[PDB]
Subunit: 245 residues, 2 copies
């Protein structure tokens, strides 16, 4: 990767008293820009952004049959009212259904999980604390790594079938307009404390005309009411560059 630091973006962060980073690449990871070079490379807990490789590995291992797979509710209550019904792949990904993905992780199993994440170069690679709970635990990944990983997915270069990479790419679509398709994923580890804060993510890419823009955002967060900033800050920056608004 090749990355240029521009301090100007810092305004949008200052305005909101947000401690964070944004990494935006046009065409490829040979062309990225960021507000904070050091935070760009620092690794954080992926939280639900981990649903992306989990889904790929799920599909690739046969744990997830195909894009039409339904994730049946077993009747037994789920801890969130949004998960208490049947879900598609895209749906499970949009609502971040924790029991759905833990179950995928349990059936993938820890040896296969580790192997795929190694092939993927996905973060620091640590899955300790239990197999259903490592995106909350030891595994850590930077903003730059996230864009690298998403770029590989975009180009079908992950060690996975082209089909399964396509399936995952479509389930991640969150906005469509005549000129562009936005593929994205949120993450939030929890509030943590004021002294030690939780992390919030928005990662994805934008297919605009013949161009592509990869992006990854994170921020320290100690209050849930700051959560929408994880989308508004990157959106303002991309608007200002004339990408999307």
């Amino acid at each position: 990767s090749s990355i240029t630091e521009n301090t100007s973006w810092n305004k949008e962060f200052s305005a909101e008293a947000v401690n964070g980073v944004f990494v935006l690449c046009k065409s490829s990871s040979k062309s990225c820009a960021t507000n904070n070079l050091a935070r760009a490379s620092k690794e954080y807990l992926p939280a639900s952004t981990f649903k992306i490789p989990n889904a790929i590995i799920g599909l690739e291992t046969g744990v997830i049959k195909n894009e039409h797979q339904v994730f049946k509710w077993d009747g037994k209550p789920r801890a969130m009212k949004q998960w208490e019904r049947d879900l598609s792949l895209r749906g499970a990904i949009q609502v971040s259904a924790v029991p759905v993905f833990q179950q995928i992780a349990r059936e993938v199993g820890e040896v296969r999980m580790q192997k795929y994440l190694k092939k993927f170069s996905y973060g620091n690679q640590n899955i300790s604390g239990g197999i259903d709970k490592f995106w909350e635990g030891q595994l850590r990944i930077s903003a730059v790594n996230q864009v690298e990983f998403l770029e590989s997915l975009f180009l079908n270069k992950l060690s996975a079938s082209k089909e399964n990479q396509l399936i995952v790419k479509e389930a991640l679509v969150t906005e469509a307009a005549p000129e562009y398709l936005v593929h994205s994923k949120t993450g939030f580890s929890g509030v943590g404390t004021e002294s030690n804060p939780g992390v919030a993510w928005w990662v994805g890419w934008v297919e605009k005309g013949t161009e592509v823009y990869f992006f990854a955002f994170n921020m320290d967060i100690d209050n849930e009411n700051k959560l929408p900033l994880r989308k508004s800050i990157p959106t303002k920056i991309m608007a200002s560059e004339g990408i999307i608004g």
Copy 2:
């Protein structure tokens, strides 16, 4: 297919003085509803809805290299401004870029094209016509990866067809319009696609007579109203 006529949507056509058909299927072509049974089976010129089989065949035969294919503008004047630029597959589909799909069809060749259309059961060139029902059937096959094409290629075209994303659903769709015609010979306007709504799928094909250009917006608005009223979108 299994298709049931209903009078509930008839008012929606009559309020706008519109002659046309909507066909709407839940889960599969085994549950289609329509305001007009006879028109549902009537074959019309597909116009740019044909860009759907075309894109699949383009990819199958390698004329379209993959989903990253850029369709580069050659600098020559074209029939619309918005076509005078390099276009993605999605781009060329969304603006119904005639010269782009003409080049694809040319490079594919007449006989090859025809062979794939038969394999797809796509209607029955300017001679090829297809019905609303045949549209839903063909789209269902596409949705289920059941066409005679790689799953990859079918996936690629399904994503290029995405026109609306919301957290509960994804709409994939395509317009077509052959242009205004004599009252004797009126033009036909099309909107076809499907909606993936949670775990469910809805297939749809709309078409309508059109002797005035100002009526065009109804082509999307009537089926949108019908599907919105049913809670789909």
